[PDB]
């Protein structure tokens, strides 16, 4: 007799994240590549898709949005270079140091009061380009901050960096903000002497969709979103057909219950629907109690690389499948979304007067465990 | 400047959670304490919530649902002995062994099929009292299984085990229910000849509410739900009052904007209500968008020890509290619910010819992050 | 064969309504009562709810939020006087004229700037006493309008009128709003020379917790909310225990199978629950599907004015309840709420520069179909 | 100053749904149309679209699921013949015929036991010709019957009707279900000697996409969810270019509040988006409290004819629109769906053992009150 106490789950391939971060470097032809892993992996975790990184030498740093994911990524042994985007509190500069972790520069006044310290402090100045408050928007401002941190040698300039706001937005008056933002830039960085290798200008969507401008450099880039593969733009711009990203996860559940019924018996109790033939029907652990199952198509599922039907009435815990032959209970199963390449997270900023508010949050399943499947996972100790 | 990425949070006081395992361990007398911790530490962290325990030797096992747990908090470096509740698979008789790790005896059949096998097999013998499909309902196949496990010494017998469906039920259906389980307990087991030090018998319920019942024997108890503070009868019945179990969670914000807003001044655009004394007004980063905002009372939140009002219209992502004294950005806000002692978690199973599917899954906040406090979160360095 | 294209609905008493009319009338001692009808009665019905007002000449007036529920009302054979609250166009004066409606005056400028017209208008005067932008806050302004409308005797001065906002809280801080707006009500007013039948004062919450008062004036009684029977103060207050108001609303359904189901058998597919005794079980056909249901408890529904309890798994669509006897299909039920005293309307405000937002709307099953009770109902011609 | 006690509705124009019956008259070159009307006219209001199907003369009978319908339908004086479709109690036989109803006639059973009455009761025979327990599958049976209604007088045959279950959906499989059941209809209805003016066979389905099929009977259609103009058949197939049906309803908002927003100001407190140019922006009494929301595409909506732009965060009860000039409150909004063509409906269907549960429900804005335009809406007196 079997206990299923995990009916379902979000299944990641570490491998096909891995993949990722390969093409998407070929794609752009990248010197140096930085993971940005925003909530928790985007809801798929951190630590795992970290270590799959570090152990492929697919990413060279990684970015996280909170010091204390930074910590912990520490503790889990991850070693390469980590770089924290919105702190930069005198009282952490310990903290900083200690631990290897990149920190933002946020303005002239910051560089100007830092206070004494050991050790070395890596920084990494952020190029105000238009939409946000973070950073220099100044050229004479920018080289009075380059005089100062090239005079300090404790500070390490990691990179000078910016990003566009409408990448992954589709039309005219986006493609001009983007004229816009790389005018900024450049009116910005010219002729200020910086080493061209710390430039780092491509998050997702510039990676994707414009990475034969040879205005934009390449050196670093940042891919985050396009890490689970899927379409950052949400529905406005078509993947290019020759970058092959995998979409790297997948809602699962398994076989609960298999029942032979015959050619015209009743599917359920108060049913419409009467079943086709002779031949066995599996129930599967899921149903509207499961608010992820509205992001699904409810007439097929996989079970062995194919294809079978969803038939009769989905229940609150409860989904029927007319399979092809006899499977055995606990034959995993695999969902279908209504579209492949739905967003896994949301997004919320909020601006006041001496604050921004940046949110990230899943909108995959977050009741469920993750697993992680694939020799990646094996290797990293993640597979059990 | 400040940037909050992390908005809202679950605040979980481990030292309240050692607290708890201590108080219902003197109120029920008990050698040991086995603490379950299904569904992630019931969604508050089953890793921190063991290393707390182990720690402080709280508990001197633990117990979870699946495998998979157990591997992943032995990878932790807990080093308590853990026992899986549903699995058995004779294939994973290699990584119960090596691990450390009890599994329950299901049936007869099982142990007299054992294979062959290295090293000692740590196993528990659950007693079949009524409300499950999971071990033994008869006197004569446990004497059976005694004699099985005495002459293999290879077997250690970890546990001699059932609990009790009705204990979190009130009334005279569940008061009979609860007796005749006790009936079939004693039937079962007297003159078996058991070291009586192996017995459990108490879930939360039955420690709670039953703790001066001679008949049930507190030798190992088996807290689960109870860790987290909440009231395990979901309304039915009251704490006793003399039992001081300590709520451990916390849904907590920041102040992320303070405006001086003077005596008769609009609140916000739109609004039907002014304010009425000139005086600071904080807007929280939470509001309509957040599921877990529906549990909790919406005119009062926490402040330093105090209890300040919310004013004015929620919107999705703001709620304004009027001040008593001019507070700083970043500042601690704690929510206050509706209901101290409501679950965080829910359980769904379901019954089929060969497979029971016993479900838990968390219902607090479950798209935000566990945070840890107190000095035992420092210790066992969950507190960054 | 039956078919049941009708197997859930809210059915509303129309005796109870007019009843509830009457004991508050008989509570406040009062001479007119005009029955507030928003948002289509409260939800349960406009129409049928004034004309069982109108048969039984439980209410005076007529008061609804639009002009189009007046034509309507007009249209249905309604003839007491109707006096709609928002409406004041110099566009629609013949209208208002034609079809005997009362308007509020809202302003000085209004009644001064009124154009020519033939017939009589009757015009409400509305008293700020605080919480409003509606109508008159000056004592002198008061007496310049009364001094217009004297002079012309096209105009019928319908009412002078006020309500009270905190006569539905508790507290200390809203005691004395309440004593603030009387004693602007009486700045206001005395000395003006006012006919005092035309005074009134008491919505819903004044009605109930306020007969006692002598300083408020009962002339013209204007109950809404509480004509449903439920508690408006949303908790705060206890309805006083020698007010009799009945709940006249209830969802119902039908019975749409009946089972002999025998003393050991699965009640539903998956289902952990089996049946106590050989006995007939009912399926009725709602389930999770209905968005009401959640205000419903889940363990009782009655069933020939006896309570029989509701056993196992609710689907999407099916409710099983186990039944005393055998009952034909067919066989009413009706639901028991969480709350009896439940509010059935949410309404929403929202105040701007030049127009004022107040959108009532029903939170009780929107979906379904009210169907009319009682003798009064086959008397106006609602019960089919 | 203004008050908008009505800030969103339902727009039903109902020259629009008269035109949608004649369309689909000439279209299936049909002699009788009858306009089914479930739901209350599928969540539109039966009588106003009855009112205006007979003052145009575009529909010759009506369809309805429920006997209080029918009578409802009579006390407003409409007097076309009405059929109600799953009632048949011998009791209601008096009711039937002194209000002209027809009734379907169930089974043989049924007309043999027809009791003694009064006056002619018109009945329907309905062919079984597959998927429904309603009426006649064997061709005996149906000449036995087709000999008790020839015999007696009183009994006025109305119709011999079947429909179509997968005219609606898209396939191989569906195409030959087609087949089939319009072999049983002739194999049922051939040699039998039926007066064929008598024959309705065409749903909404069948009339959209099988028009030029001759094996199929147009002399009485039955157009019911085409009747609202969406699209009958969920995605799967594309309306005819040819055949131009028009959606009939809108959700419209107004203008609550209109704001002079310079160049860069900020659009709202906490606002991510400033505003591009100098130039008017309006606010509408609408947002995230409205369930109905999440059907409309939230970046457009259409004022004047054309169609400006939603700019920034979206609250509970506001969203904010760029104006091309300067408006007047009260201004008309309509919102724009994200696909015109989907349903305002919902069905489910239950099967037991001796009852059919057949329940059809709005998903368009229940809350909402519905508003009637056009010429057609003044004549009939529904446009206030």
Redesign the interface.
């Known amino acids: 007799?079997?206990?299923?106490?995990?009916?379902?789950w979000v299944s990641v391939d570490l491998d096909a994240a891995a993949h990722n971060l390969q093409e998407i470097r070929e794609w752009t032809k990248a010197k140096k590549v930085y993971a940005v892993l925003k909530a928790?992996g985007y809801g798929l975790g951190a630590i795992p898709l970290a270590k799959a990184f570090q152990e492929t030498a697919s990413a060279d740093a990684l970015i996280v949005?909170?010091?204390?994911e930074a910590?912990?990524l520490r503790?889990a042994d991850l070693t390469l270079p980590i770089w924290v985007?919105?702190?930069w509190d005198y009282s952490d500069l310990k903290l900083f140091i200690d631990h290897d972790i990149v920190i933002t520069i946020?303005?002239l006044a910051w560089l100007q009061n830092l206070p004494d310290f050991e050790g070395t402090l890596k920084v990494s100045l952020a190029i105000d380009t238009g939409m946000t408050?973070?950073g220099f928007d100044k050229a004479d401002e920018i080289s009075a901050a380059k005089k100062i941190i090239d005079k300090n040698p404790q500070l390490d300039l990691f990179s000078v960096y910016t990003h566009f706001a409408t990448a992954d937005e589709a039309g005219e008056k986006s493609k001009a903000y983007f004229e816009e933002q790389l005018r900024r830039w450049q009116e910005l960085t010219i002729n200020q002497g910086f080493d061209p290798s710390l430039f780092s200008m491509a998050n997702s969507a510039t990676c994707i969709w414009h990475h034969d401008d040879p205005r934009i450099s390449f050196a670093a880039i940042r891919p985050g979103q396009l890490i689970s593969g899927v379409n950052v733009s949400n529905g406005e711009l078509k993947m290019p057909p020759n970058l092959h990203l995998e979409r790297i996860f997948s809602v699962c559940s398994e076989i609960?219950?298999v029942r032979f019924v015959k050619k015209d018996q009743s599917l359920?109790?108060?049913?419409?629907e009467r079943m086709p033939e002779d031949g066995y029907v599996a129930?599967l652990?899921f149903g509207?109690?499961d608010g992820w199952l509205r992001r699904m198509q409810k007439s097929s599922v996989i079970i062995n690389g194919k294809r079978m039907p969803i038939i009769g009435?989905?229940?609150?815990?409860?989904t029927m499948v007319k399979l092809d032959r006899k499977y055995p209970?606990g034959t995993r199963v695999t969902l279908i979304g209504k579209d492949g390449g739905e967003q896994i997270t949301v997004e919320?900023?909020?601006?006041?007067?001496?604050?921004?508010?940046?949110?990230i949050?899943?909108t995959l399943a977050?009741?469920?465990?993750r697993?992680y499947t694939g020799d990646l996972a094996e290797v990293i100790?993640a597979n059990?």
Do not use: C, F
């Open positions: 007799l079997t206990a299923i106490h995990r009916p379902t928790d949005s909170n010091l204390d910590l912990e503790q985007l919105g702190a946020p303005s408050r973070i609960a219950d359920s109790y108060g049913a419409s129930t652990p509207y109690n009435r989905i229940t609150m815990d409860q209970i919320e900023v909020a601006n006041y007067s001496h604050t921004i508010v940046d949110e949050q899943t977050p009741r469920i465990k697993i100790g059990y």
